[PDB]
Protein backbone atom coordinates (compact mmCIF):
# COMPACT_ATOMS: atom_id res chain seq x y z
CA UNK A 1 0.00 0.00 0.00
CA UNK A 2 0.98 3.65 -0.36
CA UNK A 3 1.96 5.51 2.79
CA UNK A 4 -0.70 7.95 4.03
CA UNK A 5 0.74 10.67 6.28
CA UNK A 6 -1.89 11.26 8.98
CA UNK A 7 0.24 13.35 11.36
CA UNK A 8 -0.89 16.74 12.73
CA UNK A 9 2.00 18.39 10.83
CA UNK A 10 4.85 17.52 8.48
CA UNK A 11 8.23 19.18 8.19
CA UNK A 12 8.62 18.89 4.39
CA UNK A 13 12.41 19.31 4.46
CA UNK A 14 14.81 16.70 5.82
CA UNK A 15 18.08 18.11 7.14
CA UNK A 16 19.87 14.84 7.86
CA UNK A 17 23.14 13.42 9.17
CA UNK A 18 24.79 10.05 8.55
CA UNK A 19 28.16 8.38 7.98
CA UNK A 20 29.90 6.90 4.94
CA UNK A 21 32.04 3.78 5.37
CA UNK A 22 33.66 4.14 1.91
CA UNK A 23 34.75 7.73 2.57
CA UNK A 24 37.80 8.62 0.46
CA UNK A 25 40.20 9.83 3.16
CA UNK A 26 42.95 12.31 2.31
CA UNK A 27 46.36 11.19 3.56
CA UNK A 28 46.37 9.82 7.10
CA UNK A 29 42.83 10.85 8.13
CA UNK A 30 41.66 7.20 7.97
CA UNK A 31 44.13 6.22 10.74
CA UNK A 32 42.09 6.25 14.00
CA UNK A 33 44.95 7.89 15.92
CA UNK A 34 45.01 10.77 13.41
CA UNK A 35 41.36 10.97 12.37
CA UNK A 36 38.32 12.87 13.59
CA UNK A 37 36.81 12.56 17.04
CA UNK A 38 33.39 10.94 17.53
CA UNK A 39 31.69 14.28 16.87
CA UNK A 40 33.29 14.83 13.45
CA UNK A 41 32.50 11.59 11.60
CA UNK A 42 29.25 12.86 10.10
CA UNK A 43 28.24 14.03 6.66
CA UNK A 44 25.16 16.20 6.23
CA UNK A 45 22.52 16.68 3.55
CA UNK A 46 19.21 18.38 2.81
CA UNK A 47 16.34 16.58 1.06
CA UNK A 48 13.12 18.25 -0.09
CA UNK A 49 9.64 16.75 -0.42
CA UNK A 50 9.80 15.75 -4.09
CA UNK A 51 7.23 13.00 -4.71
CA UNK A 52 6.11 13.52 -1.11
CA UNK A 53 8.92 11.29 0.15
CA UNK A 54 9.73 13.25 3.31
CA UNK A 55 6.15 13.21 4.60
CA UNK A 56 5.94 9.57 3.52
CA UNK A 57 9.09 8.77 5.52
CA UNK A 58 7.73 10.37 8.69
CA UNK A 59 4.54 8.30 8.42
CA UNK A 60 6.45 5.10 7.60
CA UNK A 61 8.70 5.39 10.66
CA UNK A 62 5.62 6.14 12.76
CA UNK A 63 3.83 3.02 11.45
CA UNK A 64 6.92 0.80 11.78
CA UNK A 65 7.02 1.32 15.54
CA UNK A 66 4.49 -1.28 16.68
CA UNK A 67 6.08 -4.12 14.72
CA UNK A 68 9.60 -3.02 15.67
CA UNK A 69 8.69 -2.81 19.38
CA UNK A 70 7.08 -6.27 19.31
CA UNK A 71 10.24 -7.62 17.71
CA UNK A 72 12.41 -6.01 20.41
CA UNK A 73 10.21 -7.45 23.16
CA UNK A 74 10.72 -11.00 21.86
CA UNK A 75 14.50 -10.90 21.35
CA UNK A 76 16.94 -11.46 24.23
CA UNK A 77 19.67 -9.59 22.36
CA UNK A 78 20.55 -6.39 24.20
CA UNK A 79 21.46 -4.44 21.04
CA UNK A 80 20.00 -5.48 17.68
CA UNK A 81 22.15 -4.86 14.60
CA UNK A 82 20.86 -7.66 12.37
CA UNK A 83 17.48 -6.49 11.04
CA UNK A 84 18.68 -5.33 7.62
CA UNK A 85 20.85 -8.39 7.04
CA UNK A 86 17.92 -10.62 7.95
CA UNK A 87 15.71 -8.70 5.52
CA UNK A 88 18.22 -9.22 2.71
CA UNK A 89 18.24 -12.94 3.51
CA UNK A 90 14.43 -13.04 3.44
CA UNK A 91 14.46 -11.17 0.13
CA UNK A 92 16.62 -13.98 -1.28
CA UNK A 93 14.66 -16.84 0.30
CA UNK A 94 11.39 -15.42 -1.07
CA UNK A 95 12.74 -15.80 -4.64
CA UNK A 96 15.29 -18.61 -4.39
CA UNK A 97 14.24 -20.59 -1.29
CA UNK A 98 12.87 -23.35 -3.51
CA UNK A 99 12.79 -24.76 -7.01
CA UNK A 100 12.33 -21.99 -9.59
CA UNK A 101 9.66 -22.91 -12.17
CA UNK A 102 10.30 -20.89 -15.33
CA UNK A 103 7.21 -18.90 -16.47
CA UNK A 104 5.60 -19.41 -13.05
CA UNK A 105 4.62 -16.37 -10.99
CA UNK A 106 7.20 -17.07 -8.22
CA UNK A 107 10.28 -17.56 -10.44
CA UNK A 108 12.26 -14.42 -11.35
CA UNK A 109 13.95 -15.95 -14.42
CA UNK A 110 13.51 -14.27 -17.80
CA UNK A 111 13.86 -16.74 -20.71
CA UNK A 112 13.03 -14.05 -23.28
CA UNK A 113 16.43 -13.71 -24.96
CA UNK A 114 16.94 -17.48 -24.64
CA UNK A 115 13.54 -18.18 -26.20
CA UNK A 116 14.42 -15.75 -29.01
CA UNK A 117 17.90 -17.30 -29.29
CA UNK A 118 16.22 -20.67 -29.80
CA UNK A 119 13.65 -19.14 -32.18
CA UNK A 120 16.34 -17.83 -34.52
CA UNK A 121 17.82 -21.34 -34.75
CA UNK A 122 14.53 -23.05 -35.67
CA UNK A 123 13.90 -20.54 -38.46
CA UNK A 124 17.40 -21.50 -39.62
CA UNK A 125 16.51 -25.21 -39.42
CA UNK A 126 13.30 -24.65 -41.40
CA UNK A 127 15.37 -22.91 -44.09
CA UNK A 128 17.50 -26.07 -44.37
Amino acid sequence: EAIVNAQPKCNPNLHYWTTQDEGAAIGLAWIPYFGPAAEGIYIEGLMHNQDGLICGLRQLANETTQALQLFLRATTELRTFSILNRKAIDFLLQRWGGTCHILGPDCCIEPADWTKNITDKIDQIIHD
Binding site: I3, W17, T80, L84, N85
Partner: protein
Protein backbone atom coordinates in the same frame (compact mmCIF):
# COMPACT_ATOMS: atom_id res chain seq x y z
CA UNK B 1 2.62 -8.37 11.31
CA UNK B 2 6.26 -8.14 10.20
CA UNK B 3 8.55 -5.11 10.25
CA UNK B 4 7.61 -2.91 7.26
CA UNK B 5 10.15 -2.02 4.60
CA UNK B 6 9.77 1.18 2.59
CA UNK B 7 10.35 1.20 -1.18
CA UNK B 8 9.95 3.85 -3.90
CA UNK B 9 7.37 2.90 -6.54
CA UNK B 10 5.26 4.99 -8.96
CA UNK B 11 6.96 8.19 -7.73
CA UNK B 12 5.75 7.42 -4.20
CA UNK B 13 6.97 5.68 -1.06
CA UNK B 14 5.21 2.37 -0.39
CA UNK B 15 5.40 -0.53 2.05
CA UNK B 16 6.27 -3.74 0.22
CA UNK B 17 3.79 -6.61 0.56
CA UNK B 18 5.58 -9.77 1.71
CA UNK B 19 2.67 -11.95 0.54
CA UNK B 20 3.26 -10.67 -3.02
CA UNK B 21 6.53 -11.18 -4.90
CA UNK B 22 7.69 -8.48 -7.34
CA UNK B 23 10.49 -9.71 -9.61
CA UNK B 24 11.11 -6.20 -10.98
CA UNK B 25 12.34 -5.33 -7.47
CA UNK B 26 16.14 -5.18 -7.52
CA UNK B 27 18.27 -5.48 -4.36
CA UNK B 28 21.87 -5.48 -5.58
CA UNK B 29 23.67 -5.39 -2.19
CA UNK B 30 23.20 -4.79 1.51
CA UNK B 31 24.38 -1.21 0.89
CA UNK B 32 20.94 -0.63 -0.70
CA UNK B 33 19.27 -1.13 2.71
CA UNK B 34 19.07 1.68 5.28
CA UNK B 35 17.69 2.18 8.76
CA UNK B 36 16.78 5.79 9.49
CA UNK B 37 15.50 7.80 12.44
CA UNK B 38 12.91 10.58 12.23
CA UNK B 39 12.20 13.09 14.99
CA UNK B 40 8.79 13.41 16.63
CA UNK B 41 9.41 17.16 16.23
CA UNK B 42 8.78 16.77 12.50
CA UNK B 43 5.21 15.61 13.18
CA UNK B 44 4.32 18.71 15.20
CA UNK B 45 4.41 17.50 18.82
CA UNK B 46 4.89 20.14 21.49
CA UNK B 47 8.60 20.32 22.33
CA UNK B 48 8.65 22.52 25.46
CA UNK B 49 10.03 20.77 28.54
CA UNK B 50 6.67 20.60 30.42
CA UNK B 51 4.86 19.05 27.45
CA UNK B 52 7.67 16.68 26.47
CA UNK B 53 8.39 15.22 29.92
CA UNK B 54 4.70 14.28 30.24
CA UNK B 55 5.31 11.73 27.46
CA UNK B 56 7.85 9.75 29.55
CA UNK B 57 7.20 7.51 32.54
CA UNK B 58 8.87 5.05 34.91
CA UNK B 59 8.14 1.31 34.76
CA UNK B 60 9.57 -1.88 36.29
CA UNK B 61 9.64 -5.41 34.92
CA UNK B 62 10.45 -4.55 31.29
CA UNK B 63 14.06 -5.10 30.10
CA UNK B 64 15.52 -2.25 28.02
CA UNK B 65 16.10 -2.80 24.31
CA UNK B 66 18.39 -1.06 21.81
CA UNK B 67 18.33 -1.12 17.99
CA UNK B 68 20.79 0.62 15.69
CA UNK B 69 19.95 3.12 12.96
CA UNK B 70 22.25 4.62 10.37
CA UNK B 71 21.01 8.11 9.53
CA UNK B 72 19.04 10.70 11.41
CA UNK B 73 17.57 14.17 11.34
CA UNK B 74 19.07 17.36 12.79
CA UNK B 75 17.00 18.21 15.86
CA UNK B 76 15.75 21.55 17.03
CA UNK B 77 15.05 20.12 20.51
CA UNK B 78 16.94 17.48 22.50
CA UNK B 79 16.86 16.64 26.21
CA UNK B 80 19.38 15.60 28.87
CA UNK B 81 18.14 14.43 32.28
CA UNK B 82 19.82 14.40 35.71
CA UNK B 83 16.92 13.26 37.92
CA UNK B 84 17.38 12.02 41.51
CA UNK B 85 14.98 10.81 44.16
CA UNK B 86 14.55 13.13 47.18
CA UNK B 87 16.99 10.85 49.05
CA UNK B 88 19.81 11.45 46.54
CA UNK B 89 19.80 8.13 44.68
CA UNK B 90 19.94 8.22 40.89
CA UNK B 91 16.70 7.65 38.97
CA UNK B 92 18.35 6.90 35.62
CA UNK B 93 21.04 4.37 34.69
CA UNK B 94 24.45 5.44 33.47
CA UNK B 95 24.76 5.27 29.69
CA UNK B 96 25.95 1.82 28.52
CA UNK B 97 29.35 1.61 26.86
CA UNK B 98 29.19 2.94 23.31
CA UNK B 99 26.01 5.01 23.71
CA UNK B 100 26.66 8.74 23.15
CA UNK B 101 24.30 11.69 22.83
CA UNK B 102 22.22 12.42 19.75
CA UNK B 103 24.66 14.13 17.35
CA UNK B 104 22.77 17.25 16.10
CA UNK B 105 20.76 19.42 18.50
CA UNK B 106 20.08 23.14 18.17
CA UNK B 107 18.92 23.32 21.80
CA UNK B 108 19.70 20.80 24.52
CA UNK B 109 17.18 21.08 27.36
CA UNK B 110 19.08 19.90 30.45
CA UNK B 111 16.72 19.14 33.34
CA UNK B 112 18.09 18.57 36.85
CA UNK B 113 15.96 17.88 39.86
CA UNK B 114 13.93 15.36 41.78
CA UNK B 115 10.93 13.11 41.46
CA UNK B 116 9.62 9.89 42.99
CA UNK B 117 10.79 7.81 39.98
CA UNK B 118 8.48 4.87 40.69
CA UNK B 119 10.00 2.33 38.31
CA UNK B 120 13.33 0.91 37.25
CA UNK B 121 13.50 2.61 33.84
CA UNK B 122 11.95 5.60 32.08
CA UNK B 123 9.99 4.67 28.90
CA UNK B 124 8.13 6.60 26.19
CA UNK B 125 4.41 6.50 27.00
CA UNK B 126 3.54 6.58 23.27
CA UNK B 127 5.95 3.83 22.21
CA UNK B 128 8.46 6.13 20.55
CA UNK B 129 12.20 5.63 20.96
CA UNK B 130 14.87 7.73 22.58
CA UNK B 131 17.36 8.44 19.81
CA UNK B 132 21.04 8.54 20.73
CA UNK B 133 24.10 8.42 18.48
CA UNK B 134 22.93 5.88 15.85
CA UNK B 135 21.36 3.77 18.60
CA UNK B 136 17.67 3.93 19.51
CA UNK B 137 16.63 2.86 23.00
CA UNK B 138 13.33 2.19 24.70
CA UNK B 139 14.67 3.91 27.86
CA UNK B 140 16.31 7.14 29.00
CA UNK B 141 19.94 7.12 30.17
CA UNK B 142 21.30 9.54 32.77
CA UNK B 143 22.94 12.72 31.53
CA UNK B 144 22.81 11.65 27.88
CA UNK B 145 21.37 13.89 25.18
CA UNK B 146 18.54 12.33 23.16
CA UNK B 147 15.85 13.25 20.66
CA UNK B 148 12.42 11.65 20.61
CA UNK B 149 11.92 9.67 17.45
CA UNK B 150 10.92 6.59 15.48
CA UNK B 151 12.77 4.25 13.09
CA UNK B 152 12.12 3.18 9.48
CA UNK B 153 13.80 0.71 7.11
CA UNK B 154 14.33 1.36 3.41
CA UNK B 155 15.50 -0.06 0.13
CA UNK B 156 17.34 2.79 -1.56
CA UNK B 157 16.78 3.47 -5.27
CA UNK B 158 19.41 2.04 -7.59
CA UNK B 159 27.93 25.06 10.49
CA UNK B 160 26.68 23.28 13.62
CA UNK B 161 25.71 25.28 16.72
CA UNK B 162 24.34 23.89 19.96
CA UNK B 163 23.01 25.77 22.98
CA UNK B 164 22.25 24.24 26.37
CA UNK B 165 19.18 25.43 28.28
CA UNK B 166 19.20 24.44 31.96
CA UNK B 167 16.23 23.78 34.23
CA UNK B 168 15.43 22.69 37.78
CA UNK B 169 12.54 20.34 38.45
CA UNK B 170 10.58 19.10 41.44
CA UNK B 171 8.01 16.34 41.29
CA UNK B 172 9.53 15.21 38.00
CA UNK B 173 7.45 12.57 36.26
CA UNK B 174 4.17 13.34 38.04
CA UNK B 175 0.89 15.17 37.50
CA UNK B 176 2.09 18.36 39.24
CA UNK B 177 5.71 18.87 38.18
CA UNK B 178 7.38 22.25 38.70
CA UNK B 179 10.02 23.65 36.36
CA UNK B 180 12.38 26.59 36.68
CA UNK B 181 14.48 28.07 33.90
CA UNK B 182 17.96 28.77 35.29
CA UNK B 183 19.59 32.16 34.69
CA UNK B 184 22.40 31.67 37.20
CA UNK B 185 22.70 29.52 40.31
CA UNK B 186 20.55 31.99 42.28
CA UNK B 187 18.19 33.41 39.62
CA UNK B 188 15.31 31.40 38.16
CA UNK B 189 12.21 32.00 36.03
CA UNK B 190 8.94 30.11 36.46
CA UNK B 191 8.70 28.02 33.31
CA UNK B 192 5.58 27.99 31.15
CA UNK B 193 4.81 25.65 28.26
CA UNK B 194 4.43 28.58 25.83
CA UNK B 195 8.05 29.69 26.35
CA UNK B 196 10.04 28.90 23.20
CA UNK B 197 13.82 28.30 23.41
CA UNK B 198 14.54 31.57 21.60
CA UNK B 199 12.35 33.40 24.12
CA UNK B 200 14.17 31.81 27.07
CA UNK B 201 17.54 32.86 25.64
CA UNK B 202 16.32 36.44 25.12
CA UNK B 203 14.79 36.46 28.60
CA UNK B 204 18.19 35.36 29.92
CA UNK B 205 20.13 38.08 28.09
CA UNK B 206 17.79 40.86 29.18
CA UNK B 207 18.04 39.72 32.82
CA UNK B 208 21.85 39.92 32.72
CA UNK B 209 21.88 43.27 30.92
CA UNK B 210 19.15 44.81 33.12
CA UNK B 211 20.77 43.61 36.35
CA UNK B 212 17.74 41.59 37.46
CA UNK B 213 19.95 38.78 38.76
CA UNK B 214 19.95 38.09 42.48
CA UNK B 215 22.34 40.33 44.41
CA UNK B 216 22.01 38.44 47.68
CA UNK B 217 23.04 34.97 48.82
CA UNK B 218 19.41 33.88 48.36
CA UNK B 219 17.42 32.44 45.49
CA UNK B 220 15.46 34.88 43.29
CA UNK B 221 12.53 33.56 41.23
CA UNK B 222 10.79 35.63 38.54
CA UNK B 223 7.30 35.20 37.11
CA UNK B 224 6.79 36.58 33.59
CA UNK B 225 3.62 38.44 32.48
CA UNK B 226 1.29 37.35 29.61
CA UNK B 227 3.63 38.71 26.88
CA UNK B 228 0.23 27.43 16.74
CA UNK B 229 3.28 27.61 14.45
CA UNK B 230 5.92 24.88 14.17
CA UNK B 231 9.62 25.66 14.54
CA UNK B 232 10.39 25.19 10.83
CA UNK B 233 7.56 27.44 9.60
CA UNK B 234 8.40 30.50 11.72
CA UNK B 235 12.04 35.81 47.05
CA UNK B 236 9.54 35.70 44.14
CA UNK B 237 8.64 38.57 41.76
CA UNK B 238 6.98 39.76 38.54
CA UNK B 239 8.04 41.24 35.21
CA UNK B 240 5.77 42.73 32.54
Amino acid sequence: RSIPLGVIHNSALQVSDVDKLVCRDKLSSTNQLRSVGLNLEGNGVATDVPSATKRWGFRSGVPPKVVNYEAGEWAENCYNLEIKKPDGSECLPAAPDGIRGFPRCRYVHKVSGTGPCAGDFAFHKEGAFFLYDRLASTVIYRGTTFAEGVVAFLILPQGYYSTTIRYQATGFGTNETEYLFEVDNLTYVQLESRFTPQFLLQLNETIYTSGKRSNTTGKLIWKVNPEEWAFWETXXXXXX
